[PDB]
A paper describes a structure:
Similar to a monorail car, they have long tunnel- or cleft-like polysaccharide-binding sites and processively hydrolyse crystalline cellulose and chitin, major types of biomass on earth, to water-soluble disaccharides. During the processive movement on crystalline chitin surface, chitinase keeps binding with single chitin chain in the catalytic cleft and repeats chemical and mechanical steps. In the chemical step, the catalytic amino acid residue and chitin N-acetyl group first cleave the glycosidic bond without attacking water, a mechanism called as substrate-assisted catalysis. From the results of this study, we conclude that SmChiA operates as a Brownian ratchet that compensates chitobiose unit interaction from the crystal surface to its binding site.
To investigate the mode of substrate binding and chain sliding, we generated an inactive mutant of SmChiA (D313A, K369M, F396A, W539A, and E540M). In this mutant, the amino acid residues constructing subsite +2 to −2 and stabilising the Michaelis complex were mutated. This mutant was designed to observe less stable substrate–enzyme complexes than the Michaelis complex. We solved four different crystal structures of the mutant bound with various lengths of oligosaccharides. These crystal structures showed that the mutant can bind to the substrate at various positions. The mutated amino acid residues were not involved in the interactions between the substrate and the enzyme in the observed intermediate complexes. We found that Glu315 showed double conformers in the crystal structure of the Sliding-intermediate (occupancy ratios of conformer A and B were 70% and 30%, respectively). The conformer A was major and interacted with the reducing end of chitohexaose via a water molecule, but the protonation state was not clear. The Trp275 should be important to relieve steric hindrance at the product-binding site during sliding motion. Next, using this Sliding-intermediate complex as an initial structure, spontaneous sliding of chitin chain was analysed in all-atom MD simulations of the wild-type enzyme.
Numbering used by the authors: 24 to 563
């Protein structure tokens, strides 16, 4: 007779191709990439003959075979593809094979193949759009937004984006390499801990807890190998396979290391580490370079060189070459993008007409034109055009776009920036003709989280009632609110100014729109980004 029916032993059924060390703070130790997951199964046979061969099947296909030598057995084998499997143990002899009932096992991988899709309802004022305009609709999500702001990946209105950028991936380096981080309490030290035993100029993760370990919706079980932002982003990819999720390297306070990459030894090491990063974290679809900025005038007053423009173009070329190789190895398309200054003076330090051949999208940072850092010269921080009271205004969206076009950048490359926050001043005074911008300020407006910056959500929620004046400047295409008694003045984007930008993008055949930061919107801004680019209402 055929053997008795084996009983699969109670035991761990969750395995991982990329393992995460739960007691490690250094990125080198935190993550272990393997070619395959080490899987184990045991069984008992309570009734009958134990057969002469034991097999482990995954969805009916043999993953392991060995002699059946007793009433209990154990099998260890490798599984090299992520997902969920119906595992059985079968005992065979010359008279037949007898298979156990199936037990599901989970083999995790960083493409999120083991995860249920993270398909969450739209929150706040967010309304559903189909991505059918063919235009970019992008936004940045910040790693630390999960703390005080409590804005997690499950709160991202993901169906209303083409591109989701993760800010920010740091580049390893201590004294002289990441000095800008020292301005943020504990932040430099956090990076040094993450990069312990890791070479300068390789990428890492700034806050491994937030990125990988913090319990979040859909990734709360203790033996879920990827939690935090990355785990949720993996599940998000399962829900939105066409969403481009890009890691953004740099940003204001993590940009210092770019200034050393004129040394090709360092640049090669960096590009290599990015490749490794993408091979490790498979849910990512490319890389965004947020170098602020070639030539300097970023966070660090002691960095910036005339060489930086050349370095930028070389970096983009070499990144593209690495990504092209990754693409044909994987059969995937990878994107290369960059967030850049919108100031003409800044833009002309770089030959974007050359660099564009390496890039899928240029994220034009057409915001922060004005702010609390200058209390004497006030203006619209993210306007399309100059205002009527100062038509020679240098920093406008159109001037940034025109600077790029003048170089020879193709318009389809250019993605225009919208702000999901306001900047502002307090104590504004000495202004003429009921235009507060013509006055001067005494300090920054009180901020939502940091001085001089207000979440759009709070502007809409608090500063569009009471004593607050509201004005839409139709010449600049820019709203502002003003509280005369305290001289609080806030410049921001609203649904109408975003609409003007979208129409401008369509008229000029630009690439689309993107925003910073997604956590600060109540839905109004992203709704308008979608609508104005011609995306159809409804779900796809
Ligand atoms: C287009 C352009 O070039 N605009 C610039 C403008 O950026 C300059 O102003 C600077 O802006 C950057 C953001 O772009 C500010 O940096 C952020 O600062 C905050 C506060 O420290 C950082 O948040 C903290 O991050 C840590 C992790 O390091 C978390 O642990 C904390 O929870 C978190 N704290 C809070 C309260 O959120 C954040 O990481 C920084 N972001 C980045 C990407 O670096 C910078 O402070 C700001 N500097 C000044 C002086 O305002 C502006 C300066 O004049 O010039 C242009 O307008
Ligand atoms: C005030 C606050 O939220 N602090 C958090 C802390 O809980 C967490 O352990 C750490 C991990 O980097 O990030 C920060
Ligand atoms: C990289 C870094 O220092 N991240 C910190 C995080 O540890 C802390 O929880 C948070 C609190 O707001 O501030 C940020």
């Amino acid at each position: 007779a055929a053997p008795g029916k084996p009983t699969i032993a109670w035991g761990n059924t969750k395995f991982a191709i990329v393992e995460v060390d739960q007691a490690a703070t250094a990125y080198n130790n935190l993550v272990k990439v393997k070619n395959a997951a080490d899987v184990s199964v045991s069984w008992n046979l309570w009734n009958g003959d134990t057969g002469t061969t034991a097999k482990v099947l995954l969805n009916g296909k043999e993953a392991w075979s060995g002699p059946s030598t007793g009433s209990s057995g154990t099998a260890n084998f490798k599984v090299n593809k992520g997902g969920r499997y119906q595992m059985q143990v079968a005992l065979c002899n010359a008279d037949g094979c007898t298979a156990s009932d199936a037990t599901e096992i989970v083999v995790a991988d960083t493409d999120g193949s083991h995860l249920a899709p993270l398909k969450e309802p739209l929150l706040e004022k967010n309304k559903p759009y189909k991505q059918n305009s063919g235009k970019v609709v992008g936004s940045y999500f910040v790693e630390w937004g999960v703390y005080g702001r409590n804005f997690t990946v499950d709160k991202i209105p993901a169906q209303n984006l083409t591109h989701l950028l993760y800010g920010f991936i740091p580049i390893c380096g201590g004294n002289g390499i990441n000095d800008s981080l020292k301005e943020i309490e504990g932040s430099f030290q956090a990076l040094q801990r993450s990069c312990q035993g890791r070479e300068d100029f390789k990428v890492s993760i700034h806050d491994p807890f937030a990125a990988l370990q913090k319990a979040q919706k859909g990734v709360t079980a203790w033996d879920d190998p990827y939690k935090g932002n990355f785990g949720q982003l993996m599940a998000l990819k399962q829900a939105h396979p066409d969403l481009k999720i890009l890691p953004s390297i740099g940003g204001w306070t993590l940009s210092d290391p770019f200034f050393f990459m004129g040394d090709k030894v360092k640049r090669d090491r960096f590009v290599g580490s990015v490749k490794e990063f993408l091979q490790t974290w498979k849910f990512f679809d490319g890389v965004d370079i947020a170098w602020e900025f070639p030539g300097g005038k970023g966070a660090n007053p002691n960095l910036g060189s005339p060489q930086d423009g050349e370095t930028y173009v070389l970096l983009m070329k070499e990144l593209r070459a690495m990504l092209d190789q990754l693409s044909v190895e994987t059969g995937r398309k990878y994107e290369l993008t960059s967030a850049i200054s919108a100031g003409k003076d800044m833009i002309d330090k770089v030959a974007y007409n050359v660099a564009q051949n390496s890039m899928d999208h240029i994220f034009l940072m057409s915001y922060d034109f004005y702010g609390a850092a200058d209390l004497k010269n006030l203006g619209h921080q993210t306007a399309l055009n100059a205002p009527a009271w100062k038509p020679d205004t240098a920093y406008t969206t159109v001037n940034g776009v025109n600077a790029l076009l003048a170089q020879g950048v193709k318009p389809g490359k250019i993605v225009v920036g919208t702000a999901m926050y306001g900047r502002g001043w307090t104590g504004v005074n000495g202004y003429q003709n009921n235009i507060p911008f013509t006055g001067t300020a005494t300090g920054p407006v009180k901020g939502t989280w940091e001085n001089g910056i207000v979440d759009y959500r709070q502007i809409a929620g608090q500063f569009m009632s009471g004593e607050w004046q509201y004005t839409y400047d139709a010449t600049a295409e820019a709203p502002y609110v003003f509280k005369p008694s305290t001289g609080d003045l806030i410049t921001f984007d609203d649904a109408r100014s975003v609409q003007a930008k979208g129409k401008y993008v369509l008229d000029k055949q630009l690439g689309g729109l993107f925003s910073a930061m997604i956590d600060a919107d109540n839905g109004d801004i992203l709704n308008s980004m979608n609508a104005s680019l011609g995306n159809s209402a409804g779900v796809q």
